[PDB]
Amino acid sequence: NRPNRLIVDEAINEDNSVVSLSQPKMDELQLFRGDTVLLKGKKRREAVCIVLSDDTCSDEKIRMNRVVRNNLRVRLGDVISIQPCPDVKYGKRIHVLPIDDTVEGITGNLFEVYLKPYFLEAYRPIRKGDIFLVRGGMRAVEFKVVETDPSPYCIVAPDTVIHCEGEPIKREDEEESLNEVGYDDIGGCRKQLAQIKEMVELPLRHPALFKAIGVKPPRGILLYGPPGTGKTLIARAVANETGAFFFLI
Amino acid sequence: NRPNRLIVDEAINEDNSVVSLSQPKMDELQLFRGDTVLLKGKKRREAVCIVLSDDTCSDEKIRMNRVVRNNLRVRLGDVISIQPCPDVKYGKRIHVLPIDDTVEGITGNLFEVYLKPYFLEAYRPIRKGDIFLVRGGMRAVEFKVVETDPSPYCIVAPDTVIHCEGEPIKREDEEESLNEVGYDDIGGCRKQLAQIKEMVELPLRHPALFKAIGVKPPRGILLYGPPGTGKTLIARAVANETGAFFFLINGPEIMSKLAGESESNLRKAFEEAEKNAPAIIFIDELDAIAPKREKTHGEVERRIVSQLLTLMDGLKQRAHVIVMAATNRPNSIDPALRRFGRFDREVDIGIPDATGRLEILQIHTKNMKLADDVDLEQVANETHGHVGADLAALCSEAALQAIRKKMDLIDLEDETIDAEVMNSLAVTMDDFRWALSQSNPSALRETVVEVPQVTWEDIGGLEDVKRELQELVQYPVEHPDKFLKFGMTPSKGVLFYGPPGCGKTLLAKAIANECQANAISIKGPELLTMWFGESEANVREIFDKARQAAPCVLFFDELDSIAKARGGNIGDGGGAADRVINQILTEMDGMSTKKNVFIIGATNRPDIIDPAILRPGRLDQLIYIPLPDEKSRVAILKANLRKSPVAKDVDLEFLAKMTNGFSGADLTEICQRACKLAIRESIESEIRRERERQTNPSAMEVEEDDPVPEIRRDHFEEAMRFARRSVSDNDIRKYEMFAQTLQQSR
Numbered sequence: 001n002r003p004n005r006l007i008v009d010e011a012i013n014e015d016n017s018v019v020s021l022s023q024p025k026m027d028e029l030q031l032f033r034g035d036t037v038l039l040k041g042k043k044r045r046e047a048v049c050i051v052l053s054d055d056t057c058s059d060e061k062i063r064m065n066r067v068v069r070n071n072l073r074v075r076l077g078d079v080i081s082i083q084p085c086p087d088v089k090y091g092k093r094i095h096v097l098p099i100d101d102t103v104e105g106i107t108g109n110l111f112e113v114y115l116k117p118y119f120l121e122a123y124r125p126i127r128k129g130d131i132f133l134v135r136g137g138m139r140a141v142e143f144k145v146v147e148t149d150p151s152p153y154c155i156v157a158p159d160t161v162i163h164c165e166g167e168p169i170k171r172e173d174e175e176e177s178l179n180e181v182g183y184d185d186i187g188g189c190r191k192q193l194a195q196i197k198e199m200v201e202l203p204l205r206h207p208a209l210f211k212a213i214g215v216k217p218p219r220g221i222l223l224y225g226p227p228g229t230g231k232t233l234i235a236r237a238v239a240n241e242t243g244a245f246f247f248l249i
Numbered sequence: 250n251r252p253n254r255l256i257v258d259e260a261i262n263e264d265n266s267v268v269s270l271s272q273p274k275m276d277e278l279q280l281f282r283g284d285t286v287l288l289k290g291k292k293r294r295e296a297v298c299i300v301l302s303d304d305t306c307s308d309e310k311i312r313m314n315r316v317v318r319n320n321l322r323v324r325l326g327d328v329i330s331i332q333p334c335p336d337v338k339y340g341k342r343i344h345v346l347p348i349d350d351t352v353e354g355i356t357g358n359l360f361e362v363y364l365k366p367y368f369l370e371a372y373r374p375i376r377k378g379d380i381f382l383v384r385g386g387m388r389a390v391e392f393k394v395v396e397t398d399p400s401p402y403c404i405v406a407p408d409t410v411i412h413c414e415g416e417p418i419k420r421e422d423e424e425e426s427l428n429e430v431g432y433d434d435i436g437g438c439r440k441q442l443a444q445i446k447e448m449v450e451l452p453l454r455h456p457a458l459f460k461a462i463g464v465k466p467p468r469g470i471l472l473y474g475p476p477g478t479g480k481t482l483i484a485r486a487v488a489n490e491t492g493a494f495f496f497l498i499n500g501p502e503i504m505s506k507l508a509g510e511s512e513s514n515l516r517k518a519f520e521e522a523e524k525n526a527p528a529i530i531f532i533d534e535l536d537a538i539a540p541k542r543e544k545t546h547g548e549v550e551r552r553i554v555s556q557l558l559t560l561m562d563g564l565k566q567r568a569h570v571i572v573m574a575a576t577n578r579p580n581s582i583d584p585a586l587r588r589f590g591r592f593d594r595e596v597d598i599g600i601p602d603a604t605g606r607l608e609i610l611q612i613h614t615k616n617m618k619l620a621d622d623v624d625l626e627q628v629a630n631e632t633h634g635h636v637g638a639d640l641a642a643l644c645s646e647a648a649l650q651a652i653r654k655k656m657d658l659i660d661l662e663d664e665t666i667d668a669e670v671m672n673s674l675a676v677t678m679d680d681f682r683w684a685l686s687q688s689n690p691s692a693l694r695e696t697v698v699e700v701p702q703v704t705w706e707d708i709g710g711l712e713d714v715k716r717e718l719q720e721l722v723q724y725p726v727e728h729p730d731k732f733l734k735f736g737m738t739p740s741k742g743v744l745f746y747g748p749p750g751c752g753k754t755l756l757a758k759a760i761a762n763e764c765q766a767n768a769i770s771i772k773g774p775e776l777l778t779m780w781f782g783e784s785e786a787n788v789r790e791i792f793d794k795a796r797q798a799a800p801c802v803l804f805f806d807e808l809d810s811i812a813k814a815r816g817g818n819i820g821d822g823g824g825a826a827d828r829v830i831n832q833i834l835t836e837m838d839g840m841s842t843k844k845n846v847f848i849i850g851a852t853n854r855p856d857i858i859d860p861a862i863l864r865p866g867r868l869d870q871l872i873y874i875p876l877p878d879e880k881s882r883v884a885i886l887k888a889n890l891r892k893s894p895v896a897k898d899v900d901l902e903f904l905a906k907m908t909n910g911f912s913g914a915d916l917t918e919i920c921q922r923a924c925k926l927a928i929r930e931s932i933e934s935e936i937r938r939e940r941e942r943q944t945n946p947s948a949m950e951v952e953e954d955d956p957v958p959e960i961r962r963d964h965f966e967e968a969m970r971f972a973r974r975s976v977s978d979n980d981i982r983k984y985e986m987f988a989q990t991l992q993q994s995r
């Protein structure tokens with residue numbers, strides 16, 4: 001029922017900095033053309049950037065650059081909460097450095113060979129965590145967050161200073177994406193999983209709600225059984241899916 | 250001598266601003282129940298309230314609740330004045346304000362829902378400074394009447410306005426809290442609570458009084474029992490209500506730190522308690538600090554034990570601190586701890602009975618909005634193996650299931666949660682059933698110590714046996730003077746022998762219930778467990794539990810179980826004496842008759858038991874429980890069928906006359922058969938009725954009618970065709986010849 005709760009679907013503009021529109025929806029929003037719209041999804045990672053390079057497709061499904069699925073999302077069928085937040089500050093500039101596929105070949109400055117021809121009159125309305133493709137060549141290389149002089153995201157400008165002293169890395173970021181075990185990874189304990197869910201849903205998903213009442217919560221759980229029955233896996237999946245901070249003692 | 254002041258006492262009526270008084274002292278003060286009356290209180294206050302006339306309260310003590318005893322700044326053991334107030338006034342606008350942090354985490358004009366019903370029709374005589382309190386929606390919060398448009402004290406009238414505003418103000422330091430635990434929070438240990446009260450009232454409430462005399466106080470209390478039986482709750486409530494400074498010494502907290510650090514912490518705690526005299530030192534999990542001396546492996550643990558011993562001895566020589574301890578078993582702690590002067594009196598907290606479980610459930614549901622179908626009597630009667638905190642977890646599970654059924658399914662995308670939805674939550678019977686069945690581990694597996702619910706009416710026949718047992722049990726304990734007058738020591742044991750199924754167990758339960766005495770039934774499985782495990786020492790603490798529950802009926806069901814496992818009639822080449830039976834004999838010889846702990850033994854094979862247990866002074870009375878005759882069988886059937894609804898067409902006299910030589914438990918098996926056939930008939934009728942009309946697609950076609958709510962004579966006839974003769978006639982002949990050979994033997 002939430003108006004800005006709408007699916008996201010295929011995208012065709014290979015540049016991630018573009019975010020779609022839906023004129024019937026734009027009338028609902030105040031979506032203005034400029035730097036940024038805050039399109040909010042899962043895990044707090046967003047794809048914030050210039051807007052309105054769409055309305056080619058049908059409505060009820062926002063076109064968002066597929067590269068903002070691995071980030072900000074997982075798969076199709078998801079939903080975006082698009083709400084404008086244009087006119088960001090203009091700090092120094094946003095980091096410039098590649099991550100994986102640039103050490104393979106001539107490196108030079110890692111900015112003025114392949115990436116420079118893209119921060120042109122669209123000076124990176126971004127949000128740290130927006131990952132995309134940008135090159136001056138084979139057209140498949142990532143652009144990741146490394147540094148942060150301004151905490152909030154900004155719109156870069158020339159005359160600034162950048163240091164590509166940083167080195168491209170491994171997929172620490174790709175491994176980070178591959179984590180957070182879930183209930184789909186639990187089998188053979190469906191009744192036990194449901195019991196754990198009904199035990200830990202109220203204390204974790206509703207902390208203030210339970211703080212309002214004066215009932216005693218279940219604060220001790222004894223998962224006992226043969227070794228290798230997924231006890232730590234069950235605990236990790238429950239903590240990750242419910243959002244509770246998991247400490248592996 | 251100036252009967253204008255009066256003593257304080259607790260209250261059975263919980264409604265605020267209400268009291269109850271002796272009936273004759275209504276003309277003395279010369280005022281009536283409805284007559285609103287003002288009552289004085291120190292620090293220069295007086296609070297007005299309604300009056301009432303009762304009897305249970307003495308002619309010298311008032312009854313009241315913690316709220317007024319808080320605003321009046323007075324505890325029990327004190328005395329105040331009183332005065333009628335026929336000059337009372339109708340309270341106009343008298344502003345109130347939510348005075349606590351409890352206001353935290355809430356929203357809405359809760360004033361309306363909490364107050365308007367609370368004040369409605371109550372004619373609450375209210376004065377300034379009132380700190381009244383009201384409870385709803387899983388929460389309990391109060392208010393203070395800050396303004397009195399007419400001052401100082403007035404009545405409430407429905408017309409009176411409420412401009413309900415203000416910001417939660419800060420309670421001063423003078424007042425206190427009701428969350429602090431009190432005796433109202435203790436259930437299942439009423440006798441134990443009274444014992445603790447009579448132990449700690451003089452040392453704490455009267456420190457200078459006891460300092461005047463030179464008697465030795467009880468400065469060591471050993472609260473032992475199963476974990477979760479409210480030992481720390483009992484200690485906290487006793488310390489808070491009596492005003493003694495409570496220091497929660499935790500065994501893990503003590504010996505969690507370094508050895509020197511642990512000893513320093515113990516010394517600092519004892520010094521602080523001595524400085525805050527009168528104070529209560531409570532040591533839960535004392536076995537952790539103080540294990541058995543032969544068992545404490547680490548030298549650090551022994552050093553900590555000795556440090557605790559020295560600190561408590563220093564309290565004994567020069568202090569005013571009462572030390573309390575909690576442990577699973579009294580023997581688990583060091584025997585040096587229980588030395589005289591250190592831990593003189595040990596209080597067996599034990600387990601709550603059906604009434605105790607009911608009290609605990611009522612305590613835990615006091616602030617819980619629960620429906621009318623809860624029938625906590627039925628829950629408590631069903632609840633077995635749950636002690637204290639087990640029932641607390643049961644109530645918490647029921648509440649959590651109700652919340653997961655309501656919140657997780659109702660308020661998802663509508664709007665943020667407010668107070669209206671949470672205060673509308675209600676706990677149903679299904680939640681309690683689910684908590685009982687699926688989500689409750691019963692931590693109790695040892696012997697039960699409670700007054701059994703089986704009465705004389707639950708037993709059919711055996712009138713002569715009933716009378717003889719009533720004599721042998723009640724007369725020593727109900728008329729001790731008569732026994733002392735004659736030169737005969739009362740008997741402390743009786744043996745029940747006869748065919749199995751005649752109700753020896755019920756005889757013991759009924760004689761325990763008639764005397765209102767706890768019954769500890771040690772069945773044959775327990776005796777065989779002690780025999781096979783080669784642990785005869787368990788009888789020692791069994792008898793200790795029986796003695797601590799005085800008056801108690803120590804029942805030994807199937808006393809011949811060990812003699813039957815170790816061979817039959819003649820058995821092996823060995824004798825009849827057994828190690829567990831021997832320990833029972835030793836304990837009975839060591840048991841004083843005055844301790845009014847009666848030992849009842851049931852033997853289905855009296856000829857195989859050792860005659861040493863039949864020696865005079867232990868089980869000299871051999872009461873024969875004969876196979877029920879016609880009248881006894883009729884009475885047994887009447888007693889059994891009182892629970893199961895049976896149709897009036899049943900003919901109990903005829904059924905008894907068919908059942909020749911049938912035992913009582915065989916008649917209950919007769920109901921098992923017939924009553925179960927009735928249950929199966931009802932179930933099959935229900936399922937066939939469900940299946941028959943599902944084919945017809947009729948929107949309105951319901952021929953609702955109960956198939957049968959009772960048990961007809963057809964079920965009993967089918968049971969007769971199924972159930973057969975009770976026992977072999979040879980066994981009955983053996984019992985009758987044993988009865989004929991009650992003397993001229995050995």
Ligand SMILES: Nc1ncnc2c1ncn2[C@@H]1O[C@H](COP(=O)(O)OP(=O)(O)OP(=O)(O)O)[C@@H](O)[C@H]1O
Pocket residue numbers: 185186187188189226227228229230231232233234
């Ligand atoms: N019930 C299960 N369902 C799916 N995978 C399981 C299950 N139990 C164990 N595994 C898998 O076993 C692997 C190793 O087990 P893991 O390290 O999670 O410990 P664990 O099985 O929880 O151990 P323990 O029983 O000793 O606590 C993991 O890849 C985990 O996914």
Ligand SMILES: Nc1ncnc2c1ncn2[C@@H]1O[C@H](COP(=O)(O)OP(=O)(O)O)[C@@H](O)[C@H]1O
Pocket residue numbers: 434435436437438475476477478479480481482483575601608609612636637638639641
């Ligand atoms: N007899 C009782 N009546 C009411 N509540 C109880 C009782 N026994 C235990 N509880 C509840 O159990 C909780 C913890 O029990 P606790 O006092 O720690 O038991 P123990 O002292 O035996 O360890 C307390 O919050 C208390 O409310």
Ligand SMILES: Nc1ncnc2c1ncn2[C@@H]1O[C@H](COP(=O)(O)OP(=O)(O)O)[C@@H](O)[C@H]1O
Pocket residue numbers: 707708709710711748749750751752753754755851884885888889912913914915917
């Ligand atoms: N005389 C009786 N009157 C009423 N009920 C009886 C009587 N005798 C036995 N019962 C009930 O029938 C069942 C069978 O009795 P049982 O316990 O075998 O007797 P005993 O304990 O003497 O062996 C018991 O559960 C008991 O509650």
